[PDB]
């Protein structure tokens, strides 16, 4: 209740009559685009395109549809089995194998620095 009773303050207020600095202009824009990240993300997007090139046409095809890399819309195991004409379990199998292939140090060593 004592948190509800708090009343907001004015962004146009002057913090410190000493320095005519308006509080409002001290507020960061947390949703602003960070140049270094968007550029590295663009570089990360390229490095994945290459790693998937090592995988088979269907191996990479299932990985992309599973996580929705191309469309941005992830797909369920059954739905991927509907494009390649198999059961969802078969796709689950192809998933585990291509993931252990990606976990192979040759393909993963390059992507390590993209943890965050």
């Amino acid at each position: 209740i004592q948190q509800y009773a708090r009343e907001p303050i004015s962004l146009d207020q002057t913090i410190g009559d000493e320095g005519d600095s308006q509080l409002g202009d001290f507020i960061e824009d947390s949703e602003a685009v960070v140049a270094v990240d968007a550029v590295s993300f663009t570089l990360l997007q390229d490095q994945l395109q290459s790693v998937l090139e090592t995988l088979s046409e269907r191996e990479a095809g299932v990985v992309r549809l599973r996580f929705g890399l191309t469309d941005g819309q992830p797909r369920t195991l059954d739905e991927i089995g509907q494009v390649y004409g198999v059961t969802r379990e078969r796709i689950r199998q192809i998933e585990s194998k291509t993931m252990s292939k990606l976990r192979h140090p040759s393909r993963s060593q390059v992507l390590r620095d993209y943890l965050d």
Binding site: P8, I9, S10, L11, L23, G24, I27
Partner: peptide, 15 residues
């Protein structure tokens, strides 16, 4: 004319 919360939760907004 934004209304945003500062570090700590308290709010501030334009007049």
């Amino acid at each position: 004319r934004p209304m945003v919360q500062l570090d700590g939760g308290r709010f501030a907004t334009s007049d």
